A paper describes a structure:
Here, we investigated whether a large separation of the nucleotide-binding domains is required for the transport cycle of [name], a homodimeric multidrug [name] transporter from [name]. Upon ATP binding, the NBDs engage in a transient tight dimer where the two nucleotides are sandwiched between the Walker A motif from one NBD and the [name] signature motif from the other NBD, thereby generating the OF conformation that is prone to drug release. Overall, our data suggest that the NBDs of [name] function with a tweezers-like mechanism distinct from the related lipid A exporter MsbA.
In order to rule out the possibility that the disulfide bond restrained a wider opening of [name], we also determined by cryo-EM the structure of the WT protein in the resting state at a resolution of 3.16 Å. The C-terminal domain of the transporter appears more flexible than the rest of the protein, and residues 578 onward could not be modeled. And on Movie S1, the structure of WT [name] is highly similar to that of the A582C cross-linked mutant (rmsd of 0.86 Å over 931 residues). Both structures adopt an IF conformation where the whole NBDs are moderately separated. The transmembrane helices are perfectly superposed (rmsd of 0.45 Å over 549 residues) while the NBDs are slightly less separated in the mutant structure. In the absence of ligand, the distance between the spins was outside of measurable range (>60 Å), consistent with the [name] IF cryo-EM structure where the Cα of the two cysteines are separated by 65 Å. By generating a molecular morph between the IF and OF conformations of WT [name], we found that the NBDs of the transporter can function according to a tweezers-like motion. In comparison, the NBDs of [name] monomers are well aligned and dimerize in a single translation.
Numbering used by the authors:
A (entry chain A), B (entry chain B): 10 to 577
Write the structure that this text describes.
């Protein structure tokens, strides 16, 4: 059952299984050559009883060490290479998924955690493919192959190892886990004290103004006393754990190596068979660590595969389906539309309005009262739960999101400065073979050109978390230049959520005034005073509405919530 | 030279050196008993040539293992205990230093880094005292004692080990450092990609609005391609490093164990001497790790001692020197006073003013222009560079800071909520044997009592980063209750630096109005509108002054910087 998704996740990378198979095979053949070195050494050590060295025996041991190293090296490369080509394929698939997910995905799921998916979870599967599967398979063959040769070569000394090794681990493992618990307990008390000092030192002015220097000292002195009473328990425990580990491990070693030595002097064994036995003990006790490592890792890695195949399961945003748009200079309408993240818990209910062509229609109201939902529905960031948004005759789901997002233009005042060249940020995603004669003219109209020419180069600069960093009206003008160069029919303007005051007003207000001409403009307001001269203003509260006029017309004709004209 | 401060830092803890000496001694005696186990094993293995076991030989090997473990355990305890008693003493000394440093210490030096001093640096010295010094000393005796017995027992097989062990390390160490460089290079490229995805995913709305989904994918695809071209270099390198480590380590093991085996069959050695030789190889190759560990650690630890003895070198705030105060209901004056952190770079120059008894005197001006320095001088948080602050006749440095800080009362509106009981926060540092009949009455006057009785208990609650958390006018009223219960003559009121708007105004303004009666009140303003009705108002700009009137009197009579009455 449980391993079914892991091979389905690997298969879709086109992994060329013949090359992985061979690499695994060579890993096995290498391990069977490790078992032969101590038998060649037995033949050397026993043969030297006639004490002239047969030079061909020590040459054959060296030749087998070099063949061992060649097959180990090719196998290690082959595993690594093929694993690196799988990880890159998974990366690729997660990336193109991520990049096309509905943007609502990102509301529910933390961006930085998503990135961890791509980066970390892929790594975890790499380790299994490259390292742990081979390590397991080879480890098993090494341990069983060592013990089956040992049992044929001397059974009594093997039975002693099969008693001593688990009887030692039966004593060491309970002791290891108890010792580790006291280490963790001491780290938690150290964090608790560190937190006591970290709260007293920023308060130090009040501590001194109060004459409280003696009482804070007494309370810190209590905190070093609990660290001391805990540290003397760690000292008591570790004084039994330390010498008990040394006693059990050498007593085991003295019993095994010493009983083998007693058989050689007794005549029950040869000096070469003791040399072979000592060489196989490394080939048992060392790859037992890679065996346990496999099980250790598989527990976390299997979760990682479910954690990724999750992602690849998600719905993509279908941008291409439906009609292409023409003549978007038509009245938008919302027709008794609703929205919510559940069928019951509506954020917006049965709302109706028209948004006229070549007109300005501002959106306003109390925070959380519904404004952001009405705007995200018109920006098609969300799809409505019932009713239709319309564009003249047709419901807007008639039209391709790729075509809708070519006719709208988005500008946020709390503007994100994405990393790149100052020109590329003015034609971002605008695949039209654009020339600097046009890019300059868009920067002119945006009142950016005179500032751009002030930067280190006449028309280049790198910006973002790298290069030049820009504030307020400098980033906002290159955004208005991007908007201007795209030629939108509908403009969708997002005021600052963090509620900053506007900067260098005369330039950015003039840049907007040239962007807005002839454009159907929808704007969402975080303070009411920024939109008061609009042709139409919409007031949204508790997922319902009352505003359907210009500001002074509504303030005269309706006035049921005059308070928001006082709070502003 | 370099170790001189380390023993001076340890000595002042009163470390009872006789007990450390003995513990070290027992560590040595234990190590000399480790060297005897393989000689008793040699005698057993050689004696079994007449193949009836002398039961007293295997009893004597067991008795020496139990004496070894007893002396190891007592020594390990003794080192740990004594080390735990040193660390607690250092902790104690750093703490009482820290707690009494001039508060200006905390402007220059980061609080959280200071805490690290206490916590981490002390730990580093503990490891040296408990673990590393003994480890070194014992390690040396173990390695030299093993090699001197080996050279007496069989010299030829010792010379082979003295050639093979360094010739192996001469090949493995350059290879280890090259491999580690490629591991670090791959971690830095992984961080660079993770940073590329982490900047594109929060921008995803702009990516989708722009139709930029294809270009962002292409740029992420470039980032997985550089990770692939780097990972296939790590694969090339590791395919040579992996099998070369296995080749050199077993070829060394086959040469040493195999040449020893050839001497036993040749007649140049006995089976028991080979068993002793194999048992000493663990006692050489294992404590070489603790030797290198010592040097590794000492490099960081010696720095740690200079890093602490630093601290203990600092000037303490002398709170006790000079006169005690009586009748502080006298005009404060500043007499041609100055301040700065350097003799040249004055923050305040030759300023003169009187602050009348039973009067209110507010401090105002542009940010960074000098206001905070004039206030911190009156709060005696700083000492003036020239001239004197005075209290009636005498310069204020006549009086004990412990007595001055009993006659002033400090209240900050951006109030720190220090951790503790809701009653103890109202009598913090007020050592007078106070009773709940008084604490209640102070909470009444502060308009806190009616809120306190609303909490989970009638007059208890734990507060801080634990228990109940309180906002604005709730924490401010227990601060005004503390101020009220102390009976200040001078009140020193600090408005919010983060420029928050005031909350539940009618209660806190009434609480202040009852605190302020008959009190000489000095207040520092972050907005001018909060202090306009004061008896006196002081305007501070560029480290000089012009305001010396009440608000409307100054605004009429002077007006040289009317702009701050417009900016407010």
């Amino acid at each position: 059952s449980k391993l079914k998704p892991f091979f389905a996740l690997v298969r879709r990378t086109n992994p060329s299984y013949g090359k992985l198979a061979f690499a695994l095979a060579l890993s096995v053949v290498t391990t069977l050559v490790s078992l032969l070195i101590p038998l060649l050494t037995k033949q050397l050590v026993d043969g030297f009883s006639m004490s002239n060295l047969s030079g061909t025996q020590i040459g054959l041991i060296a030749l087998v060490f070099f063949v061992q190293a060649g097959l180990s090296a090719y196998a290690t490369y082959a595993l690594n290479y093929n694993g690196q080509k799988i990880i890159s394929g998974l990366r690729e698939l997660l990336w193109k998924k991520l990049i096309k997910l509905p943007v609502s995905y990102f509301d529910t799921n933390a961006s930085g955690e998503t990135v961890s998916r791509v980066t970390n979870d892929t790594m975890v599967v790499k380790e299994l493919i490259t390292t742990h599967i081979s390590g397991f398979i080879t480890g098993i063959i090494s341990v069983i192959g060592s013990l089956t040769i040992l049992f044929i070569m001397n059974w009594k000394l093997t039975l002693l190892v099969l008693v001593v090794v688990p009887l030692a681990a039966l004593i060491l493992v309970p002791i290891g886990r108890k010792m580790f618990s006291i280490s963790r307990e001491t780290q938690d008390e150290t964090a608790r004290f560190t937190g006591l000092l970290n709260q007293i030192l920023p308060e130090i002015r009040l501590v001194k103004a109060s004459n409280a220097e003696d009482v804070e000292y007494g309370r810190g002195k209590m905190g070093i006393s609990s660290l001391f009473k805990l540290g003397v328990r760690e000292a008591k425990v570790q004084s039994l754990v330390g010498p008990l580990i040394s006693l059990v491990l050498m007593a085991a070693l003295v019993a095994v190596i010493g009983y083998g030595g007693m058989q050689v002097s007794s005549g029950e064994l040869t000096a070469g068979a003791l040399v072979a036995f000592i060489l196989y003990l490394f080939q048992i006790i060392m790859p037992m660590g890679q065996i346990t490592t496999f099980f250790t890792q598989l527990q976390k890695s299997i979760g990682a595969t479910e954690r990724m195949i999750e992602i690849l399961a998600e719905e993509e945003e279908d941008t291409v389906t439906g009609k292409q748009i023409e003549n978007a200079h038509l009245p938008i309408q919302l027709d008794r539309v609703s929205f919510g993240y559940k069928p019951d818990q509506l954020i917006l209910k049965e709302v109706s309005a028209v948004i006229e062509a070549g007109k300005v229609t501002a959106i306003v109201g109390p925070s959380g009262g519904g404004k952001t939902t009405l705007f995200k529905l018109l920006e098609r960031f969300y799809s409505p739960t019932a009713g239709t948004i319309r564009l003249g005759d047709e419901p807007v789901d008639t039209y391709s999101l790729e075509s809708w997002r070519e006719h709208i233009g988005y500008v946020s005042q709390e503007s994100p400065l994405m990393s790149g060249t100052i020109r590329e940020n003015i034609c971002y995603g605008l695949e039209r073979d654009v020339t600097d004669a046009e890019i300059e003219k868009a920067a002119e109209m945006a009142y950016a050109l005179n500032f751009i020419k002030e930067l280190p180069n006449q028309f280049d600069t790198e910006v973002g978390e790298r290069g030049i960093m820009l504030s307020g009206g400098q980033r906002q003008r290159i955004a208005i230049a991007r908007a201007l160069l795209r030629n939108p029919s509908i403009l969708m303007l997002d005021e600052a959520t963090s509620s900053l005051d506007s900067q260098s007003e005369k330039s950015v207000q003039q840049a907007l005034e040239v962007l807005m001409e002839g454009r159907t403009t929808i704007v969402i307001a975080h303070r009411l005073s920024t939109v008061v001269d609009a042709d139409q203003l919409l007031f949204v509260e508790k997922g319902e509405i009352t505003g359907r006029g210009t500001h002074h017309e509504l303030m005269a004709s309706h006035g049921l919530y005059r308070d928001f004209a006082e709070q502003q």
